[PDB]
């Protein structure tokens, strides 16, 4: 279907086909050399240049080499710099360039490539949709929003643009506004809309406005394979891990860690209170839009398996105690943090990002009334000096209606059924 050959390339199609045949047979090393020879002999040929880039691309996959892929990324750009490049080939080459740049984490580089594509093909709205994804990947929601507004102004029923626009509105706390876009976009069935992120946030937005249809969308997302269940809606998962909202210490196998937390709870409390009194700026307000109302702040000692050295200066005995337990300090998909919550606080029902962690809560200062946590269909409360354990990949919700502050210590651990190989290789979250 795509027209990849300009006038000159048509005359050398026999040589170009012979090289491409080598690539399709899996003789990648022979294919690279053959296209390199064609590039050497026909330095202006776009198809020869693209063949070289495709072979370098395949070779990077074979050898799992970032450096080989960087070479391919440059050759894809070289295609675009040649004279008389067919429009189909120009688009294919720069699109793959941007895709591979994103794979390498070159998000700024991918954005420049996508901006070039949009400038070269001003009527291609799918390219503008790709550009919006580029802005979203660097965290530039403002520019992403402008891009999808431009798309929706031309094609109002673009489902891909709708879900991404609705995602941005929802991230901006424009909850009611986001629902029709997320809903209509998912319902369009357009390529790219069947995504767990959009089912996740549509249901959450509906929950926040009191729309009872929220769980029909969790149920459909489960039926389409995005969620392990309607209750457990994490999106960064390892399949097969035991799934239950509440855990006992013995069920986790982390009984030595639990004993240490409970035996030594007062020193953990006292260091948290000292920071509250003398270094309160170390407690940072929750910043994921998870509160309906109230005050909730956290003082984080470990995140992504990395010790925060300045934070541990403020709780040195607690950090010294916890260093004996790699099951938590090495949990690169979890945190270790103090969590203070004040009266008048309601945390929206929400789910964590991954099923690969379990969460321990050690009670430190718990008012006698008013504080409770629901996980799935079960509500519990904290006790001073005692550990609660739940899987926060299940929907959970917290209220604080006491007459004074509530302080807990949160210790994330690797899910106990994850092998050591998985604990070393899983991407940090």
């Amino acid at each position: 279907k795509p027209k990849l050959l300009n006038k000159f390339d048509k005359t050398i199609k026999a040589e170009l086909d012979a090289a491409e045949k080598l690539r399709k047979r899996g003789k990648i090393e022979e294919a690279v050399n053959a296209f390199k020879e064609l590039v050497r002999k026909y330095p202006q040929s776009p198809r020869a240049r693209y063949g070289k880039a495709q072979c370098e691309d395949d070779l990077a996959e074979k050898r799992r080499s970032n450096e080989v892929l960087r070479g391919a990324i440059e050759t894809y750009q070289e295609v675009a710099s040649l004279p008389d490049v067919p429009a189909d080939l120009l688009k294919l080459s720069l699109k793959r360039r941007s895709d591979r740049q994103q794979f390498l984490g070159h998000m700024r580089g991918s954005l420049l490539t996508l901006q070039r594509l949009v400038q070269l093909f001003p009527n291609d709205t799918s390219l503008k949709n790709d550009l919006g994804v580029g802005y979203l990947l660097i965290g530039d929601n403002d520019n992403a929003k402008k891009v999808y507004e431009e798309v929706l102004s031309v094609t109002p029923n673009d489902g891909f643009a709708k879900v991404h626009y609705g995602f941005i509105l929802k991230a901006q706390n424009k909850i009611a506004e986001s629902i029709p876009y997320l809903k209509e976009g998912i319902e369009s069935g357009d390529p790219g809309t069947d995504d767990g992120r959009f089912y996740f946030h549509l249901g959450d937005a509906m929950q926040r406005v009191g729309n009872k249809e929220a769980y029909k969308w969790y149920e459909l997302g489960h039926k389409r394979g995005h969620f392990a269940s309607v209750w457990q809606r994490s999106l960064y998962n390892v399949n097969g891990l035991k799934a239950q909202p509440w855990w006992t210490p013995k069920e986790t196998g982390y009984t030595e860690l639990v004993k240490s937390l409970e035996r030594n709870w007062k020193l953990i409390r006292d260091e948290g209170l000292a920071v509250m009194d003398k270094a309160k700026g170390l407690f940072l307000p929750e910043d994921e839009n998870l509160r309906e109302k109230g005050d909730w702040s956290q003082f984080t000692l470990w995140q992504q398996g990395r010790r925060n050295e300045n934070a541990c200066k403020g709780a040195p005995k607690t950090c010294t105690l916890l260093e004996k337990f790699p099951e938590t300090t090495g949990c690169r998909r979890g945190q270790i943090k103090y969590s203070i919550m004040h009266p008048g606080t309601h945390v929206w029902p929400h789910t964590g990002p991954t099923n690969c962690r379990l969460q321990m809560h050690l009670g430190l200062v718990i008012p006698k009334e008013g504080c409770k946590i629901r996980c799935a269909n079960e509500t519990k409360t904290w006790e001073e000096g005692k550990v609660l354990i739940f899987d926060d990949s299940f929907e959970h919700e917290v209220w604080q209606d006491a007459s004074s502050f509530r302080l807990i210590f949160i210790v994330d651990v690797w899910h106990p059924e994850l092998t050591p190989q998985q604990r070393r290789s899983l991407p940090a979250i």
Partner: peptide, 18 residues
């Protein structure tokens, strides 16, 4: 940003190639 308690970012992991 980072996905700590929630799933609010477009992606929660960072891309580092192979």
């Amino acid at each position: 940003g980072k996905c700590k308690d929630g799933l609010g970012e477009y992606t929660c992991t960072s891309l580092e190639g192979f």
